[PDB]
Design a protein around this ligand. Sequence first.
Ligand SMILES: *[C@@H]1O[C@H](CO)[C@@H](O)[C@H](O)[C@H]1NC(C)=O
Ligand SMILES: [Zn+2]
Ligand SMILES: [Zn+2]
Ligand SMILES: [Zn+2]
Ligand SMILES: [Zn+2]
Lengths: 94, 94, 109, 109, 97, 98, 79, 80, 150, 60, 60, 75
Amino acid sequence: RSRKESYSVYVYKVLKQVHPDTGISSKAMGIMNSFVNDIFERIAGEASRLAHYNKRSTITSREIQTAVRLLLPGELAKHAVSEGTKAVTCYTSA
Amino acid sequence: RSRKESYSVYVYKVLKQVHPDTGISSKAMGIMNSFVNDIFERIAGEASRLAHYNKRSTITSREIQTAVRLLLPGELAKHAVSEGTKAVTCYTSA
Amino acid sequence: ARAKAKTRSSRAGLQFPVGRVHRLLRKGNYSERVGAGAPVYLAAVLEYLTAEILELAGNAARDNKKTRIIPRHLQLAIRNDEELNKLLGRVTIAQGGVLPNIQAVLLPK
Amino acid sequence: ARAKAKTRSSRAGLQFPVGRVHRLLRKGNYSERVGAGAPVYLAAVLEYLTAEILELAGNAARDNKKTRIIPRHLQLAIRNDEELNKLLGRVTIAQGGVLPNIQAVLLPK
Amino acid sequence: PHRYRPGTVALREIRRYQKSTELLIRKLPFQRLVREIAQDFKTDLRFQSSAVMALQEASEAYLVGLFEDTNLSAIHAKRVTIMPKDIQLARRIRGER
Amino acid sequence: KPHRYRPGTVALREIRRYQKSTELLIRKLPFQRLVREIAQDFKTDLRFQSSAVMALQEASEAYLVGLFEDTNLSAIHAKRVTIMPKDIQLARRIRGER
Amino acid sequence: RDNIQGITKPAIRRLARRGGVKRISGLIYEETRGVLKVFLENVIRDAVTYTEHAKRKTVTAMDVVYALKRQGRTLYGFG
Amino acid sequence: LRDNIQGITKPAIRRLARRGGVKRISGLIYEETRGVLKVFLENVIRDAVTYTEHAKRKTVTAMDVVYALKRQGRTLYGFG
Amino acid sequence: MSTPARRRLMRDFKRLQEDPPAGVSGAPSENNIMVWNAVIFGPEGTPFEDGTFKLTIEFTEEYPNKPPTVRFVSKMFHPNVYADGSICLDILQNRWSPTYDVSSILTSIQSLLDEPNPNSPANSQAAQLYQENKREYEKRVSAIVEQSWR
Amino acid sequence: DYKARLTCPCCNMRKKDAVLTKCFHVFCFECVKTRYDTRQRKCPKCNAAFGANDFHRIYI
Amino acid sequence: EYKARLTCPCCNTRKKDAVLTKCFHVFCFECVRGRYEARQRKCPKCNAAFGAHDFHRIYI
Amino acid sequence: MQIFVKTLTGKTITLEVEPSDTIENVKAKIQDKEGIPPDQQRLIFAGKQLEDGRTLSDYNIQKESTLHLVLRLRG
DNA sequence: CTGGAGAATCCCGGTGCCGAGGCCGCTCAATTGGTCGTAGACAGCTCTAGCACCGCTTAAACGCACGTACGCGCTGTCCCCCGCGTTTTAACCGCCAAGGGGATTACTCCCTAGTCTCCAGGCACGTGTCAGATATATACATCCTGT
DNA sequence: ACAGGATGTATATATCTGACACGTGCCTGGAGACTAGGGAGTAATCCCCTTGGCGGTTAAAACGCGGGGGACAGCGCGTACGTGCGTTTAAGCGGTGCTAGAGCTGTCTACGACCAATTGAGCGGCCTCGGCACCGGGATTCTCCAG
Ligand SMILES: *[C@@H]1O[C@H](CO)[C@@H](O)[C@H](O)[C@H]1NC(C)=O
Ligand SMILES: [Zn+2]
Ligand SMILES: [Zn+2]
Ligand SMILES: [Zn+2]
Ligand SMILES: [Zn+2]
């Protein structure tokens, strides 16, 4: 009965956000869960390493900025930073 | 005037112990320093990573032993684990 | 009795769970303290990457005349894009297959 | 006025600083709690590895007929030994050079 | 009777196998191999079917990549028939030996 | 009468020489100019530490030496002794840099 | 005992076909079933080390995934 | 600082090849050797400059370069 | 005319001079053609009537491929603009198309003045006033139009 | 008029030599290619998504 | 030449505004519809076969 | 019933709708075939400010009518 | 295949110096000694899932014949690279001069950890249906061999 | 190159079926409000290393020329590998049964975080000397060409 954590609901929401009339198999959902976990782990590890480098003690938006800039290549990095900054400004304005 | 920490003294002591009649240049000392730091980071990261995997919150001799078994290959790992177990047994005895 | 609760994801206009990302950051022991905007930023990035890869996979599946994405479609979507391939250069996808290619030398002529 | 301070390295019969290793393990936020024997074991492993590499480097230097160990000797010691070569296959030693070897095909006949 | 010139059946086999994604090794003998290898380290282990399936997937992916690389080597040598020389060259360059 | 070595002997001699020393085979100042030019494209008015430039140069020479060992293996595999762009491209493709 | 033979010649041939080779030399089979054994040993050693650390007796899919992902060979679709 | 790649000069490339263990060098090697070196330098300098501009400084440092190299899986010893 | 962006700016200015939309105007900067200055008359049928808003814009080299950046110079009160003047535009940050020109941008911002986007709370206070206190909302709009003349 | 009529609208620097199958528009191939590579898989004309197989070279 | 270039060659009187999916040849609307109603899956340039789903309106 | 909706770049997009269809539904169809979210649209007919909660018949929109689709924008 | 010539290499000796190595504060990091909350060891119960077995089907493996396409060796060539002398270039070294930016110190204040509450989004569980796989009759493209 | 027969291969239709997308109960983790304290953002200062310039030496790069050996094309031989057929074989599927142990829950105790006070050893500085690189000369060896 132990609760288990996954991103299936959100992956499905994004799927019907982008393609209104497309399904997704259970194995595909599992692969996407693994992919999201892996990317999260990579970015968090890089951000923690940056914080340790600069002798800081907190992971603010700048560390995630730079970690993304280091991981994602080129246009992916550009678009990701754009939308992430958009989101953070929207949040702080809210 | 900041004080920076290194392992030069201990490297020098072990060098004298193993070869009483040999010196080591400053650049070689720096290389040994970097090597020690690298191995330390590898082993400690692996041990903490095991601790997280097993839902544990305390790094212990067992985690370090498993980490060294995973990192060091073959006879090197066997000798390292023998030395480590001997050291911990002596420490607890004293 | 306090106020109509608004989830942080909604406040930021994202579908990924900002609260869950924040909890994972705190529990994973990545740093002693975690900033306020870090979970928001990370969730936005994850949402973008997921949306991109899902869009490519859906395009591939549609081009294959199917309405259900599967690991084969995911593998094609990844390996046909240079940037996603570079990001995922060292990953194996179960039941993924390979891109169909043959070197020109082997073809008869 | 409690008792003579016997450092843990001496108590365990090692050379490396057990206290320093323990301090680094705590400060590195690798885990929230650190066992007592973990720094001892880690120091033992580090001391063993450094002793091994230094022994090999000293032997190489003596073969070269020098009384000082230098990056060249360290590079030779690391790569000549098979286990150490596997352990450190992705590193670059400054002022290291490479192992003197020539493919037999190049040599004249 | 009808007879294909050598090679065309090979092209058809490549086309069919590069399109499907089933497993190309037999499950029971692969499992027996895995158990035989594992029994050296510690005795009388048990394996989850999912674990053995993951091992198959990883092994097939690794071997397929190795074969792409050794095929590139063989073409480099101005041939079409891969050889152990090609396999060992690929392994050496990728730093596995 | 002039004395000329057979083509190849001095090549082997200088191979033996260079695999014995550990100096830095690229000219330091032009390498520094190249590094500064390359960094020009990411952040103007950048400053460098001499130690940083030396680290870059060491890493680059090590990388090129490894690449050339792999290229030589490729050329030997092709049943010839002269390395060529196709050999370099094969080495990089197999290693996964391309 | 002696179960490496389970990796049969046609299985190797179709693996290589998926790879993209036209014809295969006769000696490839022994070499490739040696390479596979080496790779299996390398992965299984880490998996068994993990499970033995966890005081378990059943190698787990998560254990195999961790072992593989320790070698820069991350595998998706098992956890 | 325009067009300095020629600084990586023919005999220098030949010396590197010799250290690699090469007997004969074709005449076309130099162009793609320049290209490969340039690609490697961009790949490293981009990360180093990213680290630097995150740390809020105008001076690249040996530590930044070492971290960039370690990130790319080619750790370098002897610089800290 | 040196680059596609510059020639596109040339023809955009030509079209603005030849047939500007209703109640809008634009002017470059003497020292930087890439910099733009515009004055807009408030749209009819909305609280923003008789409004004289001053704008400033910045462009880059690959324009016919990216959206520019804009900001107000006069006082602003709008759910789609930040307090400093960071103006929130989809065709300018999310859904840009090269087909758009400066005149299209000006008309689009006039339409935004007409209708704030409900899910675009650049000013939370302005959004709340529009949603609930409509009367106070046109009062504030009239006030900002009043000081927009200066 | 004619030159403007049958030149690529978005750039208006070269000719119409590409078609977008999803909305059946006609732009120039390099515009299409750069927008694809910059991850704007979204038509300029009708603002609609597409893929790598929804546009092809056309001649007029 | 612009009028002659842009008009379909089957008639040379009406503007070419249709594209055939598989072969990508520009023609008119009603000439193509009449030919397809005449059962002829025939292209005047490549003789390629087509079907009811192998054509559609396109506007420049 | 086909209707004409005009953009700001000389394009007219054809929408097949019904008089009873709401402005919100028209904006959703515009999202479907033009990728413009409904909250990111302002539809104007005969100089009138259309509202999402109203229908085409409310504003007296006839066949082949021209609607000026100028967005309400968010960056 | 066997001997001189010459270049390169190797070996021994005197010498200067600058970097390794030893010694003296002293101050901060290690140590020692209680103290207390709790993470982890350990006992017990369960019921999930892996191991083991057996019978039947048949898909896949195994073995054999063949002939042909490709691997491999031998040969001619010519052109592209290597060795070498000479001239030109700029790297290198030493010195000097200016200052922009790295590194440290103090202060404050604004952000974030910690706590209690509650309520709604998300997870376990059910369920009907439509996407997908499969069987079959097509229509059409493709390979091989005679022409 | 062309044509036709044999063999794949694509297409439309009809069918079962089970994985999936929706719906429901409920429950615990995220949101809201509050407080307290310390991490770091900012300002000021010091001076260190970076940049820039200059001039003199000469070591290395650039250029040219001759020639020779090695990459490449060609041709011919043979052998071993793909193709297809007929005969095993054992994988695969189903069903059954048993039981180790993975997972969970409940207790309880050693044990590591934490604080305070004490001190000594490792860091910085500061001399001091010999290991080593170098320059000079003598002895040895590899390679080339003539014999
Ligand atoms: C993303 O953000 C960057 C950062 O300034 C900006 O230049 C770019 O225009 C943005 N792209 C968008 C919003 O698509
Ligand atoms: Zn264009
Ligand atoms: Zn369109
Ligand atoms: Zn026509
Ligand atoms: Zn045609």
